[PDB]
């Protein structure tokens, strides 16, 4: 599941034409590189969806810290502990 990333990013960068005919796509890239010299799969969302995904992220962060605190405040050990210090008082 980790190696799938490498397999996908190397096959997206590697050209279209198969190895028997890759010399054509190859000379297209060297010819186009010299032609431009003579002359990650990103998503590029704008500033509005930047505002939505940061807001999304704050909601996830707040609920994660909140549920972590609630699982500590509902796990049986803590409840036994709380009951013990309060019966002491």
């Amino acid at each position: 599941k980790f190696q799938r990333y490498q397999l996908i990013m190397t096959f997206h960068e590697r050209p279209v034409l198969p190895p028997p005919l890759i010399i054509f796509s190859h000379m297209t890239m060297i010819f186009q590189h010299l032609c431009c010299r003579w002359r990650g799969l990103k998503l590029f969302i704008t500033d509005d969806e930047l505002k939505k995904v940061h807001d999304f992220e704050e909601q996830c962060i707040e609920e994660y810290f909140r549920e972590k605190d609630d699982r500590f405040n509902s796990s049986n050990d803590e409840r036994i502990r709380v009951t013990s210090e309060r019966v002491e008082n």
Partner: protein, 346 residues
């Protein structure tokens, strides 16, 4: 955008009543902060400030919505700003609250009971909360209660503070239409202009053209609570959205604002609290000792005017007159309510 044409600010063109402080005009604006329509001679200019406050500082920083409005704005259009542009579903219930405008403290047992109370009043129903909005007394303790649910409960409060824009600290910080600024929760201790409570999620800071004094849209908030309660609820089988009023340590004028909500049609029910203080315990010892409402006995009629001469320190004839207001209030006790502290008050 649409907000800039739908609502207006008020461009206050004074005749400069210099009076005590020559900068301070009829409304109290600065010497260059010039340019009501009577002797302040304001003239309706378009709205120039609305967006989102991040509330930078104060620990947890929370996005809230602001629009600067004027006072004589169309009320149903204000609800159109509420529901479409700010994206707020219509209230299933409304909880108006009025209290001590001075920054007070309630008793700590009643503090956490009012605190864990008012929020599950909002969370269960999906209630809208109309209130003031700067950190002054009852708003500051509702805001401590709004930190108090934001420790545990997952849901959000749709608490629309309607505070005067004339009591906006740093009016230039949030000025700007469709602009988003983070308002510092840094409150100067000598700032006569008070920071808004960061916990309130929504802000009508309307403005009758004035600076530095309250009451900018208190009459507008009342008639805005009128047209909402005129609109039917989604079931619409004979009812509108209900509006309830809540009074804790209220000031002297909110006795006659209680009498306002009672005398308005339909009579908005009112709750008070006990151990709270000021107006709302003298309408609660009023409520305890009403007998037949306005048929309060003569000795406690005198005990009314003495205690208004002790807390509000009003002259004995006009504190008798505030008893005359109180007797018409307590005659309508059936819409009124008492919260006894724990005890026997439910």
């Amino acid at each position: 955008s649409w907000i800039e044409r739908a609502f207006y600010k008020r461009e206050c063109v004074h005749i400069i009543p210099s009076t005590k402080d020559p900068h301070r005009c009829c409304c109290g604006r600065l010497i260059g902060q010039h340019v009501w329509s009577i002797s302040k001679h304001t003239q309706l200019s378009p709205t120039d400030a609305f967006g989102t406050i991040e509330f930078q500082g104060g620990g947890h920083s929370n996005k809230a919505m602001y629009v600067r409005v004027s006072f004589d704005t169309k009320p149903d259009l204000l609800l159109h700003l509420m529901t479409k542009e700010w994206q707020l579903e219509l209230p299933k219930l409304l909880i108006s609250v009025h209290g001590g405008l001075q920054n007070f403290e309630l008793q700590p047992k009643l503090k956490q009971v009012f605190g864990k109370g008012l929020i599950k009043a909002a969370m269960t129903t999906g209630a809208w909360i109309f209130t003031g909005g700067v950190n002054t007394g009852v708003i500051r303790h509702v805001g401590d209660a709004l930190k108090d649910h934001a420790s545990k409960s997952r849901g959000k409060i749709c608490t629309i503070g309607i505070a005067p824009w004339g009591i906006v600290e740093n009016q230039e910080d949030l000025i700007g239409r469709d602009v988003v600024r983070p308002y510092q929760t840094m409150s100067n201790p000598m700032s006569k202009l008070t920071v808004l409570n960061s916990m309130h999620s929504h802000f009508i800071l309307a403005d009758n053209g004035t600076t530095g004094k309250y009451g900018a849209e208190v009459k507008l908030r009342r008639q805005l609570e009128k047209h909402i309660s005129l609109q039917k609820i989604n079931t619409r089988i004979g009812q509108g959205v209900p509006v309830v009023a809540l009074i804790v340590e209220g000031g002297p004028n909110v006795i006659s604002i209680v009498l306002e909500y009672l005398r308005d049609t339909p009579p908005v029910p009112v709750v008070v609290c006990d151990g709270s203080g000021r107006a709302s315990d003298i309408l609660a010892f009023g409520h305890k000792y009403s007998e037949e409402g306005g048929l309060i006995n003569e000795s406690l009629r005198d005990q009314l005017l003495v205690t208004i001469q002790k807390t509000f320190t009003y002259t004995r004839t006009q504190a008798q007159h505030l008893f005359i207001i109180l007797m018409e209030c307590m005659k309508k006790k059936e819409l009124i309510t008492v919260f006894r502290m724990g005890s026997e008050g439910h």
